[PDB]
Enzyme design. Structure first.
Site, short mmCIF file in Angstrom:
data_model
loop_
_atom_site.label_atom_id
_atom_site.label_comp_id
_atom_site.label_asym_id
_atom_site.label_seq_id
_atom_site.Cartn_x
_atom_site.Cartn_y
_atom_site.Cartn_z
N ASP A 97 5.53 -3.13 0.75
CA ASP A 97 6.73 -2.75 -0.31
C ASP A 97 6.86 -1.21 -0.41
O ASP A 97 5.96 -0.66 -0.84
CB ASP A 97 6.24 -3.42 -1.54
CG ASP A 97 7.12 -3.48 -3.00
OD1 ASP A 97 8.00 -2.74 -2.68
OD2 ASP A 97 6.61 -4.34 -3.85
N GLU B 58 8.56 1.19 -2.19
CA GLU B 58 8.78 1.45 -3.67
C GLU B 58 7.75 2.39 -4.39
O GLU B 58 6.70 2.50 -3.76
CB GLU B 58 8.85 0.27 -4.77
CG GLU B 58 9.78 -0.76 -4.29
CD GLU B 58 9.85 -1.84 -5.18
OE1 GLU B 58 10.30 -1.70 -6.33
OE2 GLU B 58 9.12 -2.78 -5.05
#
Ligand code: ZN
EC number: 3.2.1.96
Length: 285
Positions: free
Chosen positions: A126, A128
């Site tokens: 992920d 982020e």
């Protein structure tokens, strides 16, 4: 009789919930667990300036569970549930999508070490929260899906028998260019849609079969739920999975929001009926 071959992914926010809660849901007819894979959300990617090394950083909550894996993770695995570790950016120059080829090889080694140490079934990427720098510091590149692809590829090469899974978001949303002449379908086992995403992923990850596509994810904390129609679409088009994020029977919205959603999944995806145990698993740390 038997459970349909549609995998249910359950992301557990380790800061808030005990992953053993994933054991409380069963399918009446098949007798199997509703959940197929648990994702521990989340460990982090961090940079050690001293040794100029990128490493897997576990907050106290993740560490607690890894340390005590016989208590928190083994019971899932004993039931055939796969346990996946999520990797997320963590406010420094490093991230999922900015490693040079050498650094990717080194990080894939780290991942392999971690998975071996705690007997984990794979990773979820992920991209982020990293604090990417311009210009790119030494050994880092400009953030790009191509750099992310490199990392995913190196991770698979390091642990071919374990799962490599990515988020259909930011820089892991597509890997259109082969890595060392290998297509995405050869190193990505599952690509997981962001909440409500439902488009076909074949062109986003060349070579990825429909069985590796996780559609229309639900967010159980925020109350972002899938419709019956979205679930039926998974069955009729032949997609391989579905995802639910932050299920927690202790939250005030369980009876009114979570439970009805879990019953809908049992019905539409598996054509069966849900059995909720009503076993308390609290964050005992
Ligand atoms: Zn933070």
């Amino acid at each position: 009789t038997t459970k349909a071959n549609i995998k249910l992914f359950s992301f557990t926010e380790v800061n808030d919930t005990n992953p053993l809660n994933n054991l409380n849901f069963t399918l009446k007819n098949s007798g199997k667990p509703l959940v197929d894979m648990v994702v521990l959300f989340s460990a982090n990617i961090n940079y050690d300036a001293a040794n100029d090394k990128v490493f897997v950083s576990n907050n106290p909550n993740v560490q607690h569970l890894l340390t005590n894996r016989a208590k928190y993770l083994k019971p899932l695995q004993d039931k055939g549930i796969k346990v996946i570790l999520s990797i997320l950016g963590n406010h420094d120059r490093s991230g999922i999508a900015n490693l040079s080829t050498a650094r990717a090889k080194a990080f894939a080694q780290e991942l392999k070490n971690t998975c071996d140490l705690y007997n984990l079934d794979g990773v979820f990427f992920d991209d982020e929260y990293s604090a990417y720098q311009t210009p790119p510091p030494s050994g880092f590149v400009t953030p790009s899906n191509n750099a992310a692809a490199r990392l995913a590829y190196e991770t698979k090469q390091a642990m071919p028998n374990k799962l490599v899974t990515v988020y259909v978001y930011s820089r892991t949303s597509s890997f259109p260019t082969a890595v060392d002449g290998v297509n995405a379908g050869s190193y990505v086992d599952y690509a997981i849609h962001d909440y409500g995403g439902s488009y076909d992923l074949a062109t986003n990850y060349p070579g990825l079969a429909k069985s590796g596509m996780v559609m229309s994810s639900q967010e159980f904390n925020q109350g972002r739920y899938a419709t019956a129609q979205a679930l039926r679409n998974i069955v009729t088009k032949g997609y391989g999975g579905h995802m639910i994020f932050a299920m927690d029977p202790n939250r005030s919205n369980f009876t009114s929001g979570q439970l009805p959603a879990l019953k809908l999944i049992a019905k539409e995806l598996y054509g069966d009926e849900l059995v909720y145990s009503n076993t308390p698993y609290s964050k005992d740390w």
